[PDB]
Amino acid sequence: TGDQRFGDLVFRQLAPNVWQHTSYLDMPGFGAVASNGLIVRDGGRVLLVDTAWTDDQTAQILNWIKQEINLPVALAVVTHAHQDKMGGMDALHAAGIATYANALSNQLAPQEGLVAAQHSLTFAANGWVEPATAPNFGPLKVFYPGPGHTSDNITVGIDGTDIAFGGCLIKDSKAKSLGNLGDADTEHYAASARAFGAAFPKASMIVMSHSAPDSRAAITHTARMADKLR
C-alpha cells in the first residue's frame, strides 16, 4: 500500500526527496527477482542510483520520473558491474544522462556484456570517493567499503536524510545466507560490511538491492554471516 506502479516498475517514497525504484527479472520456475535502486530529488534536478535490469525497464524509470517529479535527471551512479545495476546503461546514455561508476566497474563491464559508464570514480585509501571524479554530486556521498559482494561494489549515503544504500553488499537481516559467488571476497567481506556501517554511522534506513529497506541490523547481521566464511 502506498507503492506506485509504472509499467513493470514499482516506486516507493522513502523520504520527501527519495524514492526506491524496483524492477523484476523472471527466473523460469522461480518467479520474479526484485532489484532496488534510488531516485533522489536535489533542488531542481534528479539523481539516479542504479539502473533496472534492462534498457526498457530503465526507460520506464525515466518516464515515471518525468511524469511524477518532472525534473531533469542530471546524472546516474551505478554501484557495480552486474546486470541488476548496469543493465540499463544504454537507456541513460540515449536520454543524455551523465553516468558514473567505479573505474573497476567500467573495466569489468565489457566482459560481463554490459555498457560502461561514461565517467570513472576513483577512491582514496580511506574509501571515500575522490571529489574531483564526482563533481556536483549534491547530497550523494559515495564510499568504497572494500571488496565484498564483488571487488568493485560501492555504496552511497544521502546527505540530509537518514538513508544509506548498501547495494548488493548488505543483505536483509533475515537472510539465511550471503549468496556469495566466485567474485565475492570472503576474506574481507565482513570488514567491508562493517566499514559501510562506520562510513554512514547515523543512517537508520539501510536500502539494499534485493530486499525492502531495513534497519542497521542488516549491517550487523550481514557482517556476522560473512564472519562465518573467513
Report the nearest approach of Zn ion to the CB of residue 81 (Å): 8
For the record, the C-alpha cell of 215 comes out as 534497519
3-state class (DSSP) for residue 106: helix
Q: Are 135 and 77 in contact (CB under 8 A)?
A: no
Of positions 50, 84, 185, 214, contacts Zn ion by CB under 5 A: 84
| Rounded (10°) CA dihedral 58, 155, 82, 122 | 100
Nearer to Zn ion (CB atom), residue 84 or residue 185: 84
Amino acid at 116: A
85-114 residues near Zn ion, rule: CB under 5 A: none
Report the nearest approach of Zn ion to the CB of residue 75 (Å): 21
Contact string (CB under 5 A) for Zn ion, positions 184-213, x = contact: -------------------------x----
Report the nearest approach of Zn ion to the CB of residue 98 (Å): 23
Nearer to Zn ion (CB atom), residue 63 or residue 83: 83
132-171 residues near Zn ion, rule: CB under 5 A: 168
Report the nearest approach of Zn ion to the CB of residue 153 (Å): 7
* Beta pairing class for 119-121 and 140-143: unpaired
Q: Are 151 and 123 in contact (CB under 8 A)?
A: no
| Closest to 13 measured CA to CA, from 46, 39, 43 | 39
Residues that bind Zn ion (CB under 5 A): 82, 84, 168, 209
